[PDB]
Design a protein around this ligand. Structure first.
Ligand SMILES: *[C@@H]1O[C@H](CO)[C@@H](O[C@@H]2O[C@H](CO)[C@@H](O[C@H]3O[C@H](CO)[C@@H](O)[C@H](O)[C@@H]3O)[C@H](O)[C@H]2NC(C)=O)[C@H](O)[C@H]1NC(C)=O
Ligand SMILES: *[C@@H]1O[C@H](CO)[C@@H](O[C@@H]2O[C@H](CO)[C@@H](O)[C@H](O)[C@H]2NC(C)=O)[C@H](O)[C@H]1NC(C)=O
Ligand SMILES: *[C@@H]1O[C@H](CO)[C@@H](O[C@@H]2O[C@H](CO)[C@@H](O)[C@H](O)[C@H]2NC(C)=O)[C@H](O)[C@H]1NC(C)=O
Ligand SMILES: *[C@@H]1O[C@H](CO)[C@@H](O[C@@H]2O[C@H](CO)[C@@H](O)[C@H](O)[C@H]2NC(C)=O)[C@H](O)[C@H]1NC(C)=O
Ligand SMILES: *[C@@H]1O[C@H](CO)[C@@H](O)[C@H](O)[C@H]1NC(C)=O
Ligand SMILES: *[C@@H]1O[C@H](CO)[C@@H](O)[C@H](O)[C@H]1NC(C)=O
Ligand SMILES: *[C@@H]1O[C@H](CO)[C@@H](O)[C@H](O)[C@H]1NC(C)=O
Length: 1245
């Protein structure tokens, strides 16, 4: 028959990973060889790869491509054939992008105590989950503000798992922390963990309210169990509530934002938890509702009165009922072989309804069948295939459009099966599957086929091919031969495929059969697969062990000679805030490109080959230009949805014309000895609750696996627990609550005592110390009014034991059951100083600037400060402004719109570009992307001049004869700054200047004559003083001497207007005064600059060691301008200038928002310009060295080295001394910001 070649590769070639490839040869009368060459566009980088080919049977090849300098290069793949019979060449560009290798996170908990450390392991592995060694360049921890407490430079991952033991300071501030592991390929990956002060609770509430609820409902089930230790609910005054939230919940933030709830409360006996039946009258789902959130408080009364606000929102309203859903339906119906659709009836809740008659919209042949549901609500129906283009299948249950005002109907099932292009009237049917593929448990896949006079030369041997793709690449292959010498009809061809970890959550199967007529038939099928892992891991224990059962053998089974990580925490750790899952496809969703939906490359758009014309009418009757505008499903459908390139000699296309510290538990590393490893982890002598754990071992042979959560039921028949707050004031007294628990069946009496220490006082609240009647499943609760004396953390001790052989209340009196009789607990408690706490700040800036500066620490304490309440901290920052740095890069946006609109869009592009350039943090790729936006914005603005430069919204368009004044000054400023990047024609800004000079009366100074629709770009108040001061700084920022007449006449108005706003209303003109400050600063009028800046400082609003202004919307605008005023000095920006300048920068960074837009146009413009100038005046191109040494006049000094690569790091030290006997001398290059603060307490008044 006719020869044909067949080779297939995925069109998202990952750089480093060897991507598999398929070769296939069909009907050649000699052996030939084929070589695939990876040539590159516009550059030279080739990968010649000769892959062997067999004339009848296929095999697989692998080729690894070099790492690309560019991130996503779209380069060619040239598949070539050497052979005397034929020399075939097809070439398309597929993709190469450097794959960001997956990176995990750890850090056991997301709530940490102040004096608690973080262990922080991290795992980085590529698509094939056996890991690789990667040089991670940076990993650091960020505070709520944007500071980096710790930082690690470049390091290598020997095995792919590194622990980073970092301790916190004494009292790190507590809003929320987060950790960033920035991969060497740019885009960082983050993970937070909040820090706060607390006391860990034990009881978990699990209210089982139906998450699924009908729109027609009456009864609400709920049960409230608390298994704080082992399932011993110790029923207390538990209260729950069902809170339906109204539509637009809390969208109206005026005088009312509350939602109506339905509270419930009660107790329990021993085992039944809480059985509350809730009616449905205000459980109104008729209209205006989103979801019932539920918050519960399981107060315990038989112990300390600690309450835990616990909100479980596991309840949602379902708008629909009787949900109908296709589960196993062919998107590929085929003329000749009928298809059967598996449609499923199920309630809107999720329970199928058996024996319900259903009507089916078969829009093909009017196939209306009254099928009824089975026990699973799942029917069967086949539709014969005699139609034109494509069948639409839909289901019927109700027809009803009911009373609703304008929400209550039953959701229907829609599907659009499309025909497969059968050129030789032939096609292969492949059975789809809906159930999740079991792992290990394999599965055979049924298939069907048809010939219709195709196999003329093909006879007695028809191999039947398949290529499973997973993770966006070819994974499994196979073949099977068919014995046919006939005109063979449909057949049953179950094909077997095992299911190992090498299958992604998606499993895609393609089957194509080679035919001697050239044309080939195929069928694709997606398969959802449970995410399984090559290393099945199990966690073993010596469970139900006592708290002092020290040995506590921890056995873990994993792949032979692997590396295992073992995290062990408390159950409360997962209770107070659920931590990262790190399990059950936690890696799989982070996997980039889990499937290839289409040709993944956005640049990979189209293909064009063998386009026929055929624009002629043919055989009549109803020719209608012979064929339907094919929405048909040919092989590009089966291979693009597959996601790979078809390098075929076959014709395929559509023709297509034109007790000790718990705090944690086992966190270590263990190595499998080719059979599995046990670890002897000493269990903590504290009995609090279950200890969940993790196990995510890695190996080079078998990939990563994740085992399970498995606990240690650390329980004692007799123990105590302490109910405390996290801290308490020294001057005040709290009441310690301590309960003593008995659960061994013997009925006993406990004597409870507190061993007092001179660090505190403790007095029982009860007059009598006689032991009370405590028995099985019963507890006593004693108290102590406790006031501490010693500062810092002090650990208490409470001793409870059963008094031996005292015939008492209990009918039987076996007081001491076991060797364990005394229960001595040791638990710390934070002790904060008394009085009102005040913190001052001594923030400052120093620049050695190729030399040396100095500063003396003036630290004094008022006499009313209590003893040892002063905590002095000095922080060395560097501060290249890493806070408002990353979000700024996303202000580079596309220019469009009117003249006014374009300035919203074009202007920020240039100042963000200048900011990134000043901070030395800008990549050439983003610079090239942004320069295009700059040019487009500029050359779209050039289409709005009326004349020499007078702009407006419409401009010369529509024959408008008018002109805006302020907008022209704004564009003059922007182009003046542009001259340094794209060298905007100075003739244009010159013409704009000569037009602005037209608006110049004697001393009136630029009355506005402009009309504009919006005013958000604005921010001057149109007052002649305000506009004059802005336009002067605009047309003087461009290098323009003060002797020039326009600025000379503007400065007279400035001097008169500043006096007039000084003699008149004090304040009320702070924005104008800041503009005057910047104008005088940039015009060299220092003798007036000092006076204006001191007036502003008198009018300033200083809050949290950061100075701000505001009108007594655009409040940030004047802050940036006064920052310029303090920064722009003719001789040099003095140290005193910069020290006050930083106090405005901090809020300018914190004003950022989504994509760092700074909430406005003009504000973003001015703030980015301000930050750029600050960076220019602060940083150093050659700042490769520095030195900061703070010398005490007492005992010890401190030293620091903050160079450019460490300039982000907030190096912080605390020097204990109340007097200011401290001094800093800073030498070397660069600039060093030093913020110093002390916290102290003053009780009296
Ligand atoms: C983007 O890069 C810079 C900001 O990150 C800045 O250009 C820099 O400005 C300095 C200061 O004048 C210049 O350094 C050179 O200045 C003159 C040039 O003849 C000479 O004394 C020395 O050769 C000195 O190196 C440079 O022009 C430049 N420095 C750099 C890039 O290290 C501008 O914001 C932007 N510059 C460009 C070219 O786009
Ligand atoms: C079989 O061997 C013959 C030997 O002559 C070759 O026939 C060539 O077939 C191709 C079609 O694929 C034609 O383009 C050439 O013109 C043929 N050769 C000549 C000399 O005419 C070829 O090696 C093999 N052909 C087939 C169809 O398998
Ligand atoms: C559609 O249903 C009809 C019978 O219900 C069948 O179609 C017949 O097909 C034969 C030959 O294939 C023709 O001679 C008849 O004229 C057809 N009858 C009708 C009513 O179309 C067949 O069972 C179904 N069609 C297919 C392709 O399976
Ligand atoms: C906690 O109490 C103990 C004594 O009651 C002191 O520190 C402990 O001393 C024992 C003595 O062997 C050690 O085994 C423990 O490890 C110590 N505790 C810690 C946390 O290390 C001390 O009075 C208290 N500790 C603190 C930090 O307040
Ligand atoms: C590609 O062509 C350039 C052209 O000068 C040559 O320098 C280079 O060595 C060639 N090979 C590679 C791998 O770049
Ligand atoms: C919900 O409460 C009703 C009220 O009696 C009861 O019949 C039903 O069994 C309860 N549901 C469950 C799951 O127990
Ligand atoms: C069900 O079959 C057809 C399809 O709707 C309908 O005409 C008929 O009346 C129904 N009942 C029976 C007994 O066929």
């Amino acid at each position: 028959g006719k020869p044909q070649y067949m080779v297939l590769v995925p069109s998202l070639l990952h750089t480093e990973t060897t991507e598999k490839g398929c070769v296939l040869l069909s009907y050649l009368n000699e052996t030939v060889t084929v070589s695939a060459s990876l040539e590159s566009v516009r550059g030279n980088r080739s990968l010649f790869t000769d892959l062997e080919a067999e004339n009848d049977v296929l095999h697989c090849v692998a080729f690894a491509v070099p790492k690309s300098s560019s991130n996503e290069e779209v380069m060619f793949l040239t598949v070539q054939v050497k052979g005397p019979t034929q020399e075939f060449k097809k070439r398309t560009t597929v993709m190469v992008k450097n794959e960001d290798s997956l990176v995990f996170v750890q850090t056991d908990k997301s709530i940490y105590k102040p004096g608690q450390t973080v262990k922080f392991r991290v795992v980085s592995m590529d698509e094939n989950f056996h890991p690789l060694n990667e040089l991670i360049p940076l990993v650091y921890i960020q505070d709520p503000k944007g500071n980096r407490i710790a930082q690690w430079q470049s390091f290598q991952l020997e095995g792919g798992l590194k622990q980073f033991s970092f301790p916190l300071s004494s009292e790190p501030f507590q809003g929320s922390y987060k950790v960033v592991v920035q991969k060497k390929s740019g885009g960082r990956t983050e993970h937070p963990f909040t820090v706060e002060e607390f006391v860990l609770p034990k009881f978990e509430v699990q209210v089982t309210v139906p998450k699924i609820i009908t729109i027609l409902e009456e009864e609400m089930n709920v049960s409230v169990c608390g298994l704080y230790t082992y399932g011993k609910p110790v029923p207390g005054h538990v209260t729950v509530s069902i809170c339906r939230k109204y539509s637009d919940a809390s969208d109206c933030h005026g005088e009312d934002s509350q939602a109506f709830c339905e509270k419930f409360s009660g107790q329990l006996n021993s085992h039944g938890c809480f059985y509350q039946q809730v009616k449905t009258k205000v459980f109104q789902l008729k209209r205006k509702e989103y979801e019932m959130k539920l918050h519960t408080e399981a107060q315990i009364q038989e112990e300390g009165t600690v309450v835990e606000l616990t909100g479980r929102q596991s309840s949602e309203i379902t708008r629909t009922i009787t949900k109908l859903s296709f589960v196993k339906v062919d998107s590929h119906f085929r003329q000749g072989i009928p298809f059967f659709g598996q449609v499923r009836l199920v309630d809107g809740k999720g329970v199928p309804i058996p024996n319900k008659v259903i009507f089916i919209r078969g829009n093909e042949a009017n196939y209306y069948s009254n099928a009824t549901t089975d026990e699973h609500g799942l029917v069967q129906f086949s539709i014969n295939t005699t139609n034109v283009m494509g069948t639409s299948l839909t289901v019927r249950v109700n027809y009803k459009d009911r009373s609703p005002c304008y929400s209550e109907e039953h959701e229907e099932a829609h599907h659009t099966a499309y025909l497969v292009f059968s050129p030789s009237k032939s096609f292969v049917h492949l059975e789809p599957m809906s159930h999740e593929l079991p792992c290990g448990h394999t599965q055979t896949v049924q298939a069907h086929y048809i010939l219709n006079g195709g196999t003329l030369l093909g006879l007695k041997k028809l191999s039947f091919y398949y290529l499973i793709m997973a993770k966006g690449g070819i994974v499994r292959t196979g073949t099977h031969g068919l014995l046919v010498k006939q005109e063979d009809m449909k057949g049953h061809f179950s094909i077997s495929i095992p299911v190992k970890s090498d299958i992604a959550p998606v499993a895609r199967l393609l089957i194509y059969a080679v035919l001697p007529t050239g044309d080939v038939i195929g069928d694709s099928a997606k398969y959802d697969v449970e995410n399984c892992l090559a290393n099945k891991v199990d966690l073993s224990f010596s469970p139900s062990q006592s708290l002092p059962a020290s040995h506590a053998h921890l056995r873990v089974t994993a792949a032979p000679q692997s590396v295992c990580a073992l995290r062990a925490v408390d159950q409360s750790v997962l209770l107070m805030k659920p931590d990262a899952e790190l399990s059950a496809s936690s890696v799989y969703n982070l996997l980039p490109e889990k499937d290839l939906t289409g040709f993944p490359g956005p640049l990979n758009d189209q293909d064009n080959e063998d386009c026929i014309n055929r624009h002629n009418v043919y055989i009549n009757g109803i020719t209608y230009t012979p064929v339907s505008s094919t929405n048909e499903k040919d092989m590009y459908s089966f291979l693009e949805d597959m996601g790979l390139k078809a390098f075929t000699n076959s014709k395929i296309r559509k023709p297509k014309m034109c007790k000790y510290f718990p705090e944690t538990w086992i966190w270590d590393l263990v190595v499998v000895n080719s059979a599995g490893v046990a670890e002897v982890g000493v269990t903590v002598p504290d009995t609090i609750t279950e200890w969940k754990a993790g196990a995510f071992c890695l190996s080079e042979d078998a990939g990563l696996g994740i085992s399970s959560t498995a606990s240690l039921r650390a329980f004692q028949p007799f123990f105590v627990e302490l109910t405390m707050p996290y801290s308490v004031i020294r001057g005040e007294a709290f009441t310690l609550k301590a309960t003593v628990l008995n659960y061994l069946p013997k009925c006993i009496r406990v004597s409870v005592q507190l061993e007092a220490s001179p660090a505190f006082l403790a007095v029982p609240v009860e007059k009598e110390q006689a032991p009370h009647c405590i028995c099985a499943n019963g507890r006593q609760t004693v108290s102590w009014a406790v006031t501490p004396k010693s500062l810092g953390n002090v650990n208490f001790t409470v001793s409870a034991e059963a008094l031996e052989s005292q015939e008492l209340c209990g009918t039987e009196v076996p007081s001491v059951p076991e060797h364990g009789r005394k229960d001595t607990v040791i638990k710390p408690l934070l002790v904060e100083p008394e009085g009102l706490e005040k913190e001052t700040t001594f923030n400052s800036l120093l620049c050695p600037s190729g030399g040396e500066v100095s500063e003396e620490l003036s630290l004094k304490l008022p006499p009313n400060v209590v003893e040892e309440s002063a905590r002095a901290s000095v922080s060395v920052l560097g501060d290249i402004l890493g806070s408002a740095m990353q979000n700024t890069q996303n202000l580079l946006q596309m220019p469009y719109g009117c003249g006014e609109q374009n300035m919203v869009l074009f202007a920020p592009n240039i100042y963000v570009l200048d900011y990134l350039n000043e901070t030395q943090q800008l990549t050439p790729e983003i610079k090239s992307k942004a320069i295009g936006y700059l040019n487009t914005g500029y050359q779209r603005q050039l289409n709005y001049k009326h004349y020499d430069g007078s702009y407006s919204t419409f401009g010369e368009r529509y024959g408008r004869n008018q002109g805006n004044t302020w907008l022209t000054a704004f564009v003059l400023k922007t182009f003046a700054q542009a001259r340094a990047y794209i060298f905007i024609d100075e003739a244009h800004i010159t013409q704009a200047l000569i037009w602005l000079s037209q608006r110049q009366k004697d001393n009136g100074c630029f009355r506005s004559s402009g009309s504009l629709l919006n005013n958000a770009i604005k921010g001057g108040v149109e007052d002649e003083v305000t506009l004059s001061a802005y336009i002067t700084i605009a047309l003087l920022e461009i290098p323009l001497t003060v002797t020039h007449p326009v600025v000379r006449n503007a400065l007279f108005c400035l001097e008169s207007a500043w006096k007039t706003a000084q003699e008149g209303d004090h304040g009320s003109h702070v924005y104008t005064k800041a503009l005057l400050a910047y104008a005088f600063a940039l015009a060299g009028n220092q003798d007036k600059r000092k006076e204006v800046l001191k007036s502003l400082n008198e009018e300033a609003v200083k809050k949290d060691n950061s100075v701000h202004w505001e009108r007594p919307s655009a409040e940030v605008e004047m802050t940036s301008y006064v920052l310029l005023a303090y920064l722009t000095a003719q001789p040099a920006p003095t140290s005193e200038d910069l020290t006050s300048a930083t106090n405005i920068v901090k809020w300018i960074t914190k004003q950022q928002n989504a994509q760092g837009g700074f909430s406005s146009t003009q504000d973003t413009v001015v703030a980015l310009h301000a930050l750029s100038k600050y960076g220019a005046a602060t940083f150093t191109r050659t700042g490769k060295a520095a030195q900061v040494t703070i010398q005490s006049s007492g005992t010890f000094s401190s030293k620091f080295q903050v160079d450019n690569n460490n300039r982000l790091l907030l190096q912080q030290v605390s020097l204990p001394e109340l007097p200011g006997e401290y001094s800093m001398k800073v030498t070397g290059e660069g600039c060093v910001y030093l913020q110093t603060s002390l916290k102290y307490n003053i009780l009296p008044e």
